[PDB]
Design a binder for this molecule. Structure first.
Ligand SMILES: Nc1ncnc2c1ncn2[C@@H]1O[C@H](COP(=O)(O)OP(=O)(O)OP(=O)(O)O)[C@@H](O)[C@H]1O
Lengths: 834, 71
RNA sequence: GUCCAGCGUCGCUGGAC
């Protein structure tokens, strides 16, 4: 039942008995010291960096002070004169006690005989002090010695200080009437060069039975100190001459063995005591804890309502990163529990203090600021941006790629799970995830930028560039420059660079179907069966020409190559959602790449009235933007949510391009059976995969909802039919209706991405409908549910029957893309029937 | 059979019958040291359906987690 | 038994009656 108040000064020395954590360990070690003197005697309290290494020592001394042991004042070699030997400091502190005891004694004439004996020993120590601070031997002192005295009956002749100091301690023990004297040192983390003089003055002058030494430090630091003093023993001319690998091993072992005999002799193993971290005291998940720790988050809080330390961080991480109640949120908190005590408490103290004053909001901002000032050292070695003013979109996109580069795992790197073995990568990961919840919170436009640029860059580089330890990063520098990530540019510009990188590698048979892209034709083909022809751009209408225009990209290397990348639609949607007003972005986004961008292959290559129809398309978009403003305030994305969405989306696209690749047929016009694939069907499933990936795990990982409505069953993606996509749509429908929860308040992401006018033509093209006795049952039910969620009825009765059976003016439907040819197909064979 | 049946989800739900499961059953039961009442509880806990995920160092870790562990 | 779909590179798996 330990209560910690965050509003206390929280200094290392500010901890009282009630504030002290390891109360059980303190009494255990006090007993060990008391027992030992009753029957080398050097104790080493070992503790990691920033874990009570000073407050614990003070408590141990206080318990001893209040078989008699007189505690010397604690000393630290770091806050001392540089050249002053330890023996001088200890002798000075001994002098104060005995002089204070003698003067305060004032009984009879004992302080007339004892004082002379004590003063005699000090003069002897002062005479022999010159041995400590001599840079050379002085021969005139030879006659100064050999003036042998029978006093104290020294075991060995000479001017050795160790024997003289020993008799000095014996006299003080008699005067003070104490069994032994306790000398307490302190850690040397700030400046560990001063720790060598401590070690020499312990192995030489403190070896009696009247002295107990309690040292503090870190063995991982003391060993480096000792090993450094060992290599200074080898003759330099030898180290630089015998530089063979066989000889280096021989001298390597003779030192790693010499230091261990030094440590195992100076700090005996049976006396070392290791401090306890937070995880040991609290426990793992539901495991019972050794002790009980509680914290207070407000000056007005009552001591009977203080919550557990695990729960205090649990809420600071749940809403800090916008994560739900689950195992993945419990993994972040468990990592924090293993942090140093000082760093763990400081980030908590900063977060809860700032949050309380703000209420008197942007909760993740407080967490990000607290983390930034906490692990600010790990950022520098990681190399991320440290400028507060440059915190932005592309700077964050740079941070994700660099962190993945250091981790060297392009598959699950963007998940930002602190699972790296290295400590710097683990520390840098939690800070990064906070920043994602910062920028992407409350805005749909930034969310689509993180998904497409933050995670798209990593995955594409994995499959198309990395398929020599200096060529690898040579490409990385080459790749980062080509995609121009880091500069402030729109996502639509990034789509074209994405298109160029993928298209360089030609797949088998050189078919013009790639990952989420189709390579349309520019020149004219000869003897093409059926109504297959070139893609004539000026045959579309309002709300369909704009959809195509925003979905067209061109690369101008060698011959001119056209494309129909689905990545452009995602980028174009992001730009519309950004400006949200002024009617100019919707005018400018539709015409940004058609005739201005002249992309070049990467250097690693080896080769109706127009006025009255367009404003109607424009006005619908403005209506869509109006709805977005009032609903998108409730978006709470998390780094896990964005990272997972790209994973399912990327896997889905790779399958669709690999299953429709060889299904092109000479009579694939207006494809009605699932075994026939045209150009329009491929584009239909490319935009369907994106609409499906959001739906599946908007319920699983979003923070607004506390549970999921998918139900139970295998999670599958639509690649040839919409049976899977419709099946999930229905099941959530009754679950969201039996319990009264609207689609807007549970799946805000999916609701907005399903009502965008840009994607409406692509959902139901002319040549992308499965017309069959069984298939049309699902497609019609698919149509009814989509319209019910959107509210608006996209397809009227006439056009729907026109599409299903087998020219009506169309504005919300692609009409000519299926007839367009695809490079490399040649459409020789014919569809097989069975 | 229920004591010796365990399933693994890698790419498609795989079903296994391993002798190592039987040793696991005997090891769990034998540490009861309880009366009749707890035997029914312990015996019922031994027989169940357990699905375990593929180790990370395999080529189907991401797909297995994506497909979900269910029926 | 039969039909639809999904994963791997024919085999595996889900679902329906
Ligand atoms: N018993 C305790 N209860 C609460 N907090 C503690 C306790 N002991 C230590 N701390 C925390 O540790 C911080 C500093 O600890 P300490 O000074 O002992 O470690 P150090 O900085 O590694 O060591 P040194 O100051 O000797 O170099 C304090 O500010 C406090 O927040």
């Amino acid at each position: 039942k330990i209560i910690i108040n965050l509003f206390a000064p929280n200094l290392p020395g500010s901890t009282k008995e009630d504030d002290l954590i390891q109360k059980s360990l303190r009494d255990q070690l006090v007993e060990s010291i008391r027992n030992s003197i009753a029957y080398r005697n050097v104790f080493f309290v070992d503790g990691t960096r920033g874990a009570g290494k000073t407050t614990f020592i003070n408590s141990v001394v206080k318990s001893l002070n209040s078989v008699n042991i007189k505690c010397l004042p604690t000393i630290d070699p770091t806050k001392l004169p540089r050249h002053e030997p330890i023996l001088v400091t200890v002798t000075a502190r001994l002098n104060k006690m005995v002089s204070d005891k003698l003067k305060g004694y004032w009984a009879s004439n004992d302080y007339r005989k004892q004082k002379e004996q004590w003063q005699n020993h000090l003069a002897q120590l002062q005479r022999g002090l010159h041995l400590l601070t001599d840079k050379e031997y002085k021969p005139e002192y030879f006659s100064d010695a050999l003036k042998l005295d029978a006093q104290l009956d020294y075991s060995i002749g000479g001017q050795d200080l160790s024997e003289i100091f020993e008799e000095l301690v014996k006299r003080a023990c008699e005067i003070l009437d104490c069994k032994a004297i306790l000398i307490t040192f302190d850690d040397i983390d700030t400046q560990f060069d001063a720790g060598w003089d401590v070690l020499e003055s312990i192995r030489k002058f403190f070896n009696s039975r009247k002295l107990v030494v309690v040292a503090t430090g870190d063995l991982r630091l003391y060993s480096q100190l000792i090993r450094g003093k060992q290599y200074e023993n080898y003759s330099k001319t030898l180290l630089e001459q015998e530089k063979e690998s066989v000889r280096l091993a021989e001298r390597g072992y003779m030192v790693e063995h010499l230091e261990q005999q030094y440590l195992l002799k100076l700090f005996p193993v049976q006396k070392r005591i290791q401090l306890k971290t937070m995880l040991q005291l609290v426990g793992e998940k539901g495991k019972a804890g050794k002790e009980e720790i509680k914290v207070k988050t407000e000056p007005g809080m009552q001591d009977i309502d203080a919550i557990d330390v695990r729960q205090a961080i649990g809420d600071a991480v749940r809403e800090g990163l916008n994560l739900r109640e689950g195992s993945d949120a419990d993994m972040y908190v468990n990592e924090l529990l293993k942090q140093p005590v000082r760093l763990l408490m400081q980030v908590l103290q900063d977060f809860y203090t700032k949050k309380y004053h703000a209420t008197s909001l942007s909760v993740p901002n407080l967490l990000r600021n607290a983390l930034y000032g906490s692990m600010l050292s790990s950022i520098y070695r990681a190399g991320l941006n440290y400028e507060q003013h440059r915190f932005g979109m592309d700077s964050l996109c740079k941070d994700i790629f660099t962190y993945v580069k250091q981790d060297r795992d392009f598959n699950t790197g963007f998940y930002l799970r602190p699972q790296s073995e290295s400590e710097a990568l683990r520390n840098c990961s939690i800070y990064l995830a906070s920043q994602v919840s910062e920028n992407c919170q409350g805005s749909l436009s930034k969310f689509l930028q993180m998904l497409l640029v933050g995670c798209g860059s990593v995955s594409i580089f994995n499959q198309f560039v990395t398929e020599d330890r200096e060529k690898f990063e040579q490409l990385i520098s080459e790749y980062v420059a080509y995609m121009s990530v880091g500069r402030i540019e729109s996502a639509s510009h990034w789509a074209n660079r994405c298109c160029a990188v993928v298209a360089n590698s030609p797949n088998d048979e050189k078919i013009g179907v790639f990952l989420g892209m189709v390579q349309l034709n520019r020149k004219s083909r000869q003897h093409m069966p059926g109504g297959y022809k070139k893609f004539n751009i000026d045959t579309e209408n309002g709300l369909a020409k704009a959809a195509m225009a925003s979905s067209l990209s061109t690369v101008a290397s060698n011959n001119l190559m056209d494309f129909c990348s689905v990545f452009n639609l995602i980028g174009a949607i992001a730009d519309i959602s950004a400006c949200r007003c002024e009617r100019s972005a919707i005018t400018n986004a539709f015409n940004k790449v058609i005739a201005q961008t002249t992309c070049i292959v990467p250097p690693w290559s080896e080769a109706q009235d127009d006025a009255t129809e367009f404003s109607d398309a424009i006005t619908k978009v403005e209506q869509w933007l109006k709805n977005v403003n009032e609903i998108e305030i409730g978006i709470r994305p998390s780094a896990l949510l964005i990272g997972k969405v790209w994973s399912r989306f990327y896997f889905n696209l790779n399958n669709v391009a690999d299953q429709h690749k060889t299904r092109l047929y000479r009579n694939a016009e207006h494809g009605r059976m699932a075994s026939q694939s045209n150009a329009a069907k491929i584009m239909r499933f490319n935009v369907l995969a994106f609409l499906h990936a959001v739906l599946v795990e908007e319920s699983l990982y979003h923070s607004v909802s506390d549970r999921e409505y998918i139900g139970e069953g295998l999670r599958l993606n639509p690649v040839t039919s919409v049976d899977e996509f419709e099946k999930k749509i229905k099941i959530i429908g009754e679950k969201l209706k039996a319990d009264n929860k609207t689609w807007k308040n549970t799946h805000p992401l999916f609701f907005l991405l399903i009502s965008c006018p840009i994607l409406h033509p692509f959902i139901f093209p002319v040549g992308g409908i499965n017309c069959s006795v069984k298939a049309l049952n699902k497609e019609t039910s698919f149509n009814k549910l989509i319209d019910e969620i959107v509210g608006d009825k996209l397809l009227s009765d006439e056009e729907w029957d026109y599409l299903t059976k087998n020219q009506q003016i169309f504005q919300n439907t692609i009409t000519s893309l299926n007839s367009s040819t695809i490079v490399g197909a040649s459409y020789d064979k014919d569809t097989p029937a069975r | 059979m229920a004591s010796s049946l365990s399933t693994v989800a890698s790419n498609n739900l795989m079903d296994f019958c391993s002798v190592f499961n039987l040793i696991g059953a005997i090891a769990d039961i034998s540490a009861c040291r309880c009366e009749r009442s707890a035997i029914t509880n312990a015996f019922n806990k031994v027989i169940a359906q357990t699905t375990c995920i593929v180790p990370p160092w395999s080529e189907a870790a991401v797909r297995a987690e994506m497909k979900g562990s269910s029926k």
